[PDB]
């Protein structure tokens, strides 16, 4: 339950910054899928880091292993600086474009100047990408605290969510950087012309940015269940687990 048991340190190294970025979104995802009951509690194992309870996929369960494996394609996508956004979307079967809830993870590699706020889809806003740009890596132990701070607000947020209405499903959806060939799709994902789109009336939320030396990962969220070019996809997590 040392931080090192889950994450690497010396995040100034690009290599270590890499591994951190993946495991971060893999951990958050595992938490998100658990607390919103996309999968059985049996699919997850839990360790405690200092203050915080952090979740992992339980590879002893084949259903968990199958879902856990979708991320292995993303790891390759991140080394090559291809992955821009990784988002978990919720919908009611089978209106896969009628989004009810989304947890989005947006990336920034080695202080890229700026990112085009695309405006017909996604959760990305002008103010969001500003914060992402301005956010700076300081040191590993500062990032440890940024993590702690961020993951905490993630728990608070889901705590205030109304239950996920049955007959719902979830999808992994990814959007790419300009460095990525027009034909790239990570292992386990399928090509799709559709990212995701959100209603205007929906309540959004900024959960926080965490930074490695060469990668900056911002978490944004939106949900009905609160009181106040070229894409990739995994259509149904429920189906993957079976």
Coordinates of C-alpha atoms in Angstrom, one line a residue:
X1 CA 0.0 0.0 0.0
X2 CA 3.0 2.2 -0.6
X3 CA 2.4 4.5 -3.6
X4 CA 5.3 2.7 -5.3
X5 CA 3.3 -0.6 -5.1
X6 CA 0.8 0.9 -7.6
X7 CA 2.6 3.7 -9.4
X8 CA 6.2 4.4 -10.4
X9 CA 8.1 7.3 -9.0
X10 CA 10.8 9.6 -10.5
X11 CA 8.1 10.9 -12.9
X12 CA 10.6 13.2 -14.5
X13 CA 11.7 10.3 -16.7
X14 CA 9.5 10.1 -19.8
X15 CA 9.3 6.3 -19.4
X16 CA 8.1 6.6 -15.9
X17 CA 5.7 9.4 -16.9
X18 CA 4.3 7.0 -19.5
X19 CA 3.4 4.1 -17.1
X20 CA 1.9 6.5 -14.6
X21 CA -0.4 8.0 -17.2
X22 CA -1.9 4.7 -18.2
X23 CA -2.2 3.2 -14.6
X24 CA -3.9 6.5 -13.6
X25 CA -6.7 6.2 -16.0
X26 CA -6.9 2.5 -15.5
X27 CA -7.3 2.9 -11.8
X28 CA -9.9 5.7 -12.1
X29 CA -11.8 3.6 -14.6
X30 CA -11.8 0.6 -12.3
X31 CA -13.2 2.8 -9.6
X32 CA -15.8 4.4 -11.9
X33 CA -17.0 1.0 -13.2
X34 CA -17.2 -0.3 -9.6
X35 CA -19.1 2.6 -7.9
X36 CA -21.6 2.9 -10.8
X37 CA -22.0 -0.9 -10.7
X38 CA -21.2 -1.6 -14.4
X39 CA -19.5 -4.7 -13.0
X40 CA -19.9 -6.9 -9.9
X41 CA -17.8 -6.0 -6.9
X42 CA -16.1 -9.4 -7.3
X43 CA -14.3 -7.9 -10.4
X44 CA -12.3 -5.5 -8.3
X45 CA -9.6 -5.6 -5.6
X46 CA -8.8 -2.7 -3.4
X47 CA -5.6 -1.4 -1.9
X48 CA -5.2 1.8 0.2
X49 CA -2.7 4.5 -0.6
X50 CA -2.1 6.7 2.4
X51 CA -5.5 8.4 2.8
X52 CA -7.2 7.0 -0.2
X53 CA -8.8 3.8 -1.3
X54 CA -7.8 3.0 -4.9
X55 CA -9.3 0.3 -7.0
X56 CA -7.9 -2.3 -9.4
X57 CA -9.3 -4.9 -11.8
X58 CA -9.2 -8.4 -10.3
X59 CA -7.4 -10.6 -12.9
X60 CA -8.6 -13.7 -11.1
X61 CA -12.0 -13.0 -12.6
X62 CA -12.1 -13.6 -16.4
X63 CA -14.7 -10.9 -16.9
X64 CA -12.4 -8.4 -15.2
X65 CA -9.4 -9.7 -17.1
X66 CA -11.2 -9.1 -20.4
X67 CA -12.1 -5.5 -19.5
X68 CA -8.7 -4.9 -18.0
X69 CA -7.1 -6.0 -21.3
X70 CA -8.8 -3.2 -23.4
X71 CA -6.3 -0.8 -21.8
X72 CA -3.2 -2.7 -23.1
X73 CA -4.0 -1.3 -26.6
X74 CA -4.0 2.2 -25.1
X75 CA -0.6 1.8 -23.6
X76 CA 0.9 1.5 -27.1
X77 CA -1.3 4.4 -28.2
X78 CA 0.2 6.6 -25.4
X79 CA 3.9 5.9 -26.0
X80 CA 3.5 7.1 -29.6
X81 CA 1.7 10.3 -28.5
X82 CA -1.4 9.2 -30.3
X83 CA -4.0 9.2 -27.6
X84 CA -5.7 12.6 -26.9
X85 CA -8.9 11.7 -25.0
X86 CA -10.1 8.5 -23.4
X87 CA -13.7 8.6 -22.2
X88 CA -16.1 6.3 -20.4
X89 CA -19.7 7.0 -21.6
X90 CA -23.0 5.8 -20.2
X91 CA -26.1 5.2 -22.2
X92 CA -29.3 3.2 -22.3
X93 CA -29.3 0.2 -24.6
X94 CA -29.4 0.5 -27.4
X95 CA -29.2 4.3 -28.1
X96 CA -25.3 4.3 -28.1
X97 CA -25.2 8.0 -29.0
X98 CA -27.8 9.1 -26.4
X99 CA -25.3 9.8 -23.6
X100 CA -26.4 10.0 -20.0
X101 CA -23.1 10.2 -18.3
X102 CA -19.4 10.6 -19.2
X103 CA -16.0 10.5 -17.5
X104 CA -13.4 12.0 -19.8
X105 CA -9.7 11.8 -19.6
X106 CA -7.8 14.4 -21.8
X107 CA -4.1 14.2 -22.4
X108 CA -1.2 16.6 -23.0
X109 CA 2.3 15.5 -24.0
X110 CA 5.5 17.3 -23.3
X111 CA 4.1 20.8 -23.0
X112 CA 2.4 21.0 -26.4
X113 CA 1.5 24.6 -27.0
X114 CA -2.3 24.4 -27.4
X115 CA -5.2 22.1 -28.3
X116 CA -8.0 22.9 -30.7
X117 CA -11.2 22.9 -28.7
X118 CA -13.3 20.9 -31.2
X119 CA -16.9 22.1 -30.8
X120 CA -19.5 19.7 -32.4
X121 CA -18.5 16.9 -30.0
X122 CA -16.8 15.9 -26.8
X123 CA -16.8 17.4 -23.3
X124 CA -13.9 19.7 -24.1
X125 CA -14.5 23.5 -23.5
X126 CA -12.3 26.6 -23.9
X127 CA -11.8 27.0 -20.2
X128 CA -11.0 23.4 -19.7
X129 CA -8.1 23.3 -22.2
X130 CA -6.8 26.6 -20.7
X131 CA -6.4 24.9 -17.3
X132 CA -4.8 21.9 -19.0
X133 CA -2.3 24.2 -20.7
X134 CA -1.5 26.2 -17.5
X135 CA -1.2 23.1 -15.3
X136 CA 2.5 22.3 -14.7
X137 CA 4.4 19.3 -13.5
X138 CA 6.3 20.3 -10.3
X139 CA 7.7 17.1 -8.7
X140 CA 6.6 13.5 -8.1
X141 CA 5.6 14.0 -4.5
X142 CA 3.6 17.1 -5.5
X143 CA 1.9 14.9 -8.1
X144 CA 1.2 12.4 -5.3
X145 CA -0.8 15.1 -3.6
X146 CA -2.5 16.3 -6.8
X147 CA -3.6 12.7 -7.3
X148 CA -4.9 12.4 -3.8
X149 CA -6.7 15.7 -4.2
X150 CA -8.2 14.7 -7.5
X151 CA -9.2 11.2 -6.7
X152 CA -10.9 12.6 -3.6
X153 CA -13.1 14.9 -5.6
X154 CA -13.9 12.0 -7.8
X155 CA -15.3 10.1 -4.8
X156 CA -17.3 13.1 -3.6
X157 CA -18.8 13.6 -7.1
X158 CA -20.0 10.0 -7.5
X159 CA -21.4 10.1 -4.0
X160 CA -23.8 12.8 -5.1
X161 CA -25.0 10.8 -8.1
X162 CA -28.4 9.2 -8.4
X163 CA -28.3 5.4 -9.0
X164 CA -27.4 4.2 -12.5
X165 CA -30.7 3.2 -14.0
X166 CA -30.9 -0.5 -15.0
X167 CA -30.7 -1.4 -18.6
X168 CA -27.8 0.9 -19.1
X169 CA -24.4 0.1 -20.7
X170 CA -20.9 1.6 -21.0
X171 CA -18.4 2.3 -23.7
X172 CA -14.7 3.2 -24.1
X173 CA -14.3 5.9 -26.7
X174 CA -11.0 7.5 -27.8
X175 CA -10.1 10.5 -29.9
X176 CA -6.6 11.2 -31.4
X177 CA -3.9 13.7 -31.7
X178 CA -2.6 15.1 -35.1
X179 CA 0.5 12.8 -34.9
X180 CA -1.8 9.8 -35.4
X181 CA -2.1 8.2 -38.9
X182 CA -5.6 8.4 -40.4
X183 CA -5.9 4.7 -39.9
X184 CA -4.8 4.0 -36.3
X185 CA -6.9 1.9 -34.0
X186 CA -5.5 0.4 -30.8
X187 CA -5.7 -3.3 -30.1
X188 CA -9.2 -4.2 -28.7
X189 CA -10.8 -1.1 -30.2
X190 CA -12.8 -0.7 -33.4
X191 CA -12.8 2.2 -35.9
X192 CA -15.8 4.6 -35.6
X193 CA -16.7 8.0 -37.1
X194 CA -18.5 8.8 -33.9
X195 CA -17.0 10.0 -30.6
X196 CA -19.7 11.2 -28.3
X197 CA -22.0 14.2 -27.9
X198 CA -23.6 15.8 -24.9
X199 CA -26.9 17.7 -24.4
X200 CA -26.5 21.4 -23.7
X201 CA -28.6 21.3 -20.5
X202 CA -26.3 18.8 -18.8
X203 CA -24.3 19.6 -15.6
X204 CA -20.6 19.3 -16.1
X205 CA -17.8 19.0 -13.6
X206 CA -14.0 19.4 -13.5
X207 CA -12.4 16.8 -11.3
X208 CA -8.7 17.8 -11.7
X209 CA -5.4 17.6 -13.6
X210 CA -2.5 15.4 -12.6
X211 CA 0.9 15.7 -14.3
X212 CA 3.9 13.5 -15.0
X213 CA 7.0 15.1 -16.4
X214 CA 5.9 14.5 -20.0
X215 CA 2.2 13.8 -19.7
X216 CA -0.7 15.8 -18.2
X217 CA -4.0 14.1 -17.6
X218 CA -7.1 16.1 -17.0
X219 CA -10.4 14.6 -15.8
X220 CA -13.7 16.0 -16.8
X221 CA -17.2 14.7 -16.1
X222 CA -20.9 15.2 -16.9
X223 CA -24.1 13.4 -15.7
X224 CA -27.9 13.6 -15.8
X225 CA -27.7 12.0 -12.4
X226 CA -26.5 15.0 -10.4
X227 CA -28.7 17.3 -8.4
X228 CA -26.5 20.4 -8.7
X229 CA -12.7 12.9 -38.4
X230 CA -11.3 9.7 -36.9
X231 CA -12.2 7.8 -33.7
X232 CA -12.1 4.6 -31.7
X233 CA -14.5 2.6 -29.6
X234 CA -15.4 -0.3 -27.4
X235 CA -19.2 -0.5 -27.9
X236 CA -20.2 -2.4 -24.7
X237 CA -18.2 -3.2 -21.6
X238 CA -21.1 -5.5 -20.5
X239 CA -20.7 -7.6 -23.6
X240 CA -16.9 -7.7 -23.3
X241 CA -17.3 -9.2 -19.8
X242 CA -19.3 -12.0 -21.3

